[PDB]
Design a protein around this ligand. Structure first.
Ligand SMILES: O=P(O)(O)OC[C@H]1O[C@](O)(COP(=O)(O)O)[C@@H](O)[C@@H]1O
Ligand SMILES: [Mn+2]
Ligand SMILES: [Mn+2]
Ligand SMILES: [Mn+2]
Ligand SMILES: [Mn+2]
Lengths: 328, 328, 320, 328
């Protein structure tokens, strides 16, 4: 996997984010997701890889573009790709927090090829955090005690993040009961998980259930940033079990370590769409010296080098023209 | 009003914010609000003013501390004090975005002494924006068209902010219909209004109904930053009309210009509690060089100088100790 | 020239900067310059170009690249070998790329330069044959400011004294760098640099490089080559230059599709230098600060990169 | 010493820096020094202290304003004042790096009343640095070995800062010989020393001879930030010895520990004039949203709380008017 592909992936997430931003707060989820899918597919087909989507918009049944198995790329090293063209159920359409475009790449077989089902997740940051510090089968209380001990802080210092959902009431109650502070995001548990390993995020732990593709993407990031994570797939009906069986998953209650989610040489890239607790959103800027432009804020990382690059890009644009020109 | 008082106010908002943060995401809206009231009252009694609370926690009936008419301060120039010990009590409770501590000061008579009623609000930023660019009795479409022409952008470039509430459904649709992007905040229309005048917020217009104290405080900020705002109090019951004559307000359908909400020599200060559209929240930091501390982010502005100060403060703290040590 | 090449170029400047930093302030010109060169050549040979060095072991005419579109390469493995070696300000690693024939193929001679930033600056706003006063008056009018607000930048050198005197006399503020007129020129177009204008004589390679950047960021510049010795004249003639007194517009220095990349080695008026950082969460790393830009898209990318490293190991492990 | 004086001091250093900036690069060190002195004097007399200048512009013989012994302030707690209206008059006059305006306050007697003589200095940052880590009679190599051990790094990682002067050749050579990296500043060893305790300075150790007033000022900062320093006055002729006996100093070869230079409850404030390796300089800014303004960057800190505040101030201004209007 050539060292060039890392920086080429940022451009993909950037184009996808600018497309999404044209639809931000337009109250049309479908238009936002389609802008992002279109931009991200068109841009991947300019990347020099022999890519196979292993995590994408769905099965070829359901999704015309970026479907499982889709081959993408102009040609190059053989890589498996994990994609989230636009993170968020409604975030972008309402202008909510933590909207993101996400892309990861691994050597063939480097990702758990997750169906879109729910996944329980627990994650903590820290390059020196040891395996076993978090376990999904331990109580919230014991995981938090171990985290607090390793970080050297009183329990009330710890900021636990989870999604505002009824399914998380118990996590919330138990964490508050043992003294921690528990903040709630409305969506976007890729940002929520990775925040545990980002400087100055104000987030120490992530506990919650969210999308499985998002779990894998976040594990990719933390593979690069340092941290520990445990996840478990959840199945609501028999068709989800069939999807897993077709992907090779038969131990349905397997606990995946972070190394089982993403292994080997990993590249992870994301661009912000709206402001979130990982990356800021796209912004319109006017400057006399340099004119008007959109600003995107992105991050690309690589597990083998451990290199992390934060990127602020200025894309020239005459904002007298319609914003949908940012679509591809 | 001495030049000393401006910088002194930021210490008040900082202490109120640290107190509030100790309660962030504890799910106890009362405990947060009173942590912040108690820190702020103690901190104000060390400020060198002869201050009278004209906007506060309520009337002496309902509020033991920071009630209307309360005298505060160690002694000094006579000023009216408009405060919000915690803008976003529920916010802070769930660690949502846009929670703030806020304090403003004017010479005697400088604020609209707003009762606790609702208030229609429209705001735009820009230090060259003309009086009349926005008006509450015009349609959304005509206001946005004037704003778009004044900023020199296509309508789809504009980002309108409003609170996610049934009462704004019509603003939202109308703004979307005429081509603008409309983003929704869950709470915190002080931040929402002030974002319009803050560099790189990504918010161009605020349109909404919220708390009247909040609109006076936001108007105070905008008087310092540059912008235009129009507001009107709403009275739903006879009791609200009674609070108004008790504060001396009798012209119920008055539309207030920004000069009618905050006039003369105005100081505005605020500190972030959580991350928001205006300020970053409090963060725990560890460094080998200096040890561990809480970092706060604050702004303090004065209208006569137009001086705006961005303040990042590092407050030493051993986080092996209980976070409630930050209280009072 | 394919929209990859821009993001590939930053990696070249980043690697050369880490290598240069390992030699920072060590007092060894040669060891710095050979760390930088070695890393830049190795990184460039991973870039997908048929590159030919036209300005700049990395000798003029050297072919570099793994293979691709045909491009002219202007390079400064270490702009400020002296600079990195004494730990001075404004040490940068730099790379620019243009389509074939896009750069003035400048001999390594001195060059008079004047430059101002701004996307709407009309050509002729600066001209080397106008007085310093009239240049500055036109610039102050264009920026909408009183003359006393202008900050003019030049190098602290005897040859610049008349510039300095005249600019002060007409009321401007005139600041002096000790070297690094790549960064000095490009600061006129770098926001918040506090530099409005650059006037002075410096290396012609360095002038081409700055022109490539301003072509991307917006601004104007004029230059003229200076020949003090017969050898320099011969070296121009062998490059095809025979109008020794030509004034060059910015477009004559760098034209067409251009990519410019740089990474700071020491802190300077354009970029911060490389820093050792420790964090409890992330561990320890060197931070680089880079910029890369392209004239056809006018896309500008600011890049802060964290390179994980155990600083109990020798710093020369950042060499290539 | 009330907490109110800390934030009042920043305004002083801001006013002096703006006045200095009006003279930056004008080639007239006199006019710069005088604009700074005038501004600092006037602003000081608005601060609520009973202040005595113990370090200032000179003796009443040579300096009409801010002379040793001068009383300053509007009235308040009694403090000794150590002033540098303009650290870097020559710096400012050429537009060089590391010009600062500086103000430090302490309880009566808490500064070394430094004479205008040269001072050998060595300094390192870090709150856990033990007294004795640096000593002027140990070799440069042994100081650097202890410092590398304390920072937990290979010697080759250390960055040593000194000034580019003949008198420092042996420092430079020895640091290079034992494997360290050595960066050179042309002037401004207040900033050079304080950078050792400043985040992201890239400077680990300061070693060199410079001004003794400047040594005291930097020691005050390091008492607030964490670090260790040693200093020794040096004397090149009788007039210099007389300067010391006039201030009561008779042990001419005393090695001063940091606690001998500044002790007790210290407030340190500084505003950058030019960009340096501790603070950024004053900049002209034009915003479409906010209009045009001068931005100053300051820091204020206190030794007893260890609170540090970083302050970015935007001073509204029409730059069509002459820059000398920033004078006082
Ligand atoms: O320049 P010298 O005479 O060699 O001594 C250095 C001392 O003077 C300074 O360089 C300040 O000089 P200026 O205020 O005139 O610029 C200090 O930073 C330093 O303390
Ligand atoms: Mn998605
Ligand atoms: Mn409130
Ligand atoms: Mn060179
Ligand atoms: Mn001075």
């Amino acid at each position: 996997m050539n060292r060039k592909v890392a920086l080429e992936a940022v451009r993909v997430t950037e184009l996808a984010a600018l497309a999404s931003w044209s639809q931000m707060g337009r109250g049309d989820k479908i238009a936002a997701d389609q802008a992002a899918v279109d931009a991200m597919r068109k841009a991947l087909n300019e990347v020099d890889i022999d890519g196979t989507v292993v995590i994408g918009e769905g099965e070829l049944d359901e999704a015309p573009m970026l479907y499982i198995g889709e081959k993408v790329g102009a040609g190059g090293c053989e890589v498996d790709i994990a994609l989230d063209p636009l993170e968020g159920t409604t975030i972008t359409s309402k202008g909510g927090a933590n909207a993101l475009t996400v892309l990861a790449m691994a050597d063939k077989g480097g990702f758990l090829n997750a169906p879109d089902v729910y996944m329980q997740k627990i994650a903590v940051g820290g390059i020196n955090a040891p395996k076993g510090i978090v376990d999904l089968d331990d109580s919230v209380t014991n995981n938090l005690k171990r985290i607090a001990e390793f970080k050297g802080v009183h329990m009330s210092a710890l900021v636990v993040c989870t999604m505002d959902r009824p399914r998380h009431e118990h996590i919330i109650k138990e964490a508050r009961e043992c003294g921690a502070r528990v903040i709630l995001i409305n969506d976007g548990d890729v940002s929520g998980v990775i925040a545990t390993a980002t400087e100055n995020s104000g987030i120490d732990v992530y506990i919650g259930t969210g999308g499985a593709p998002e779990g894998v993407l976040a594990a990719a990031a933390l593979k690069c940033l340092g941290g520990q994570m445990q996840a478990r797939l959840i199945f609501n009906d028999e068709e989800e079990i069939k999807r897993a069986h077709r992907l090779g998953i038969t131990d349905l209650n397997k606990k995946y370590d972070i190394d089982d989610l993403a292994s080997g040489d990993i590249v992870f890239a994301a661009t912000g769409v709206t402001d979130g607790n990982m990356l800021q959103g796209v912004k319109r800027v006017n400057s006399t010296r340099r004119g008007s432009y959109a600003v995107t804020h992105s991050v690309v990382m690589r597990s083998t080098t451990k290199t992390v690059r934060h990127i602020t890009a200025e894309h020239s644009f005459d904002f007298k023209e319609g914003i949908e020109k940012f679509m591809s």
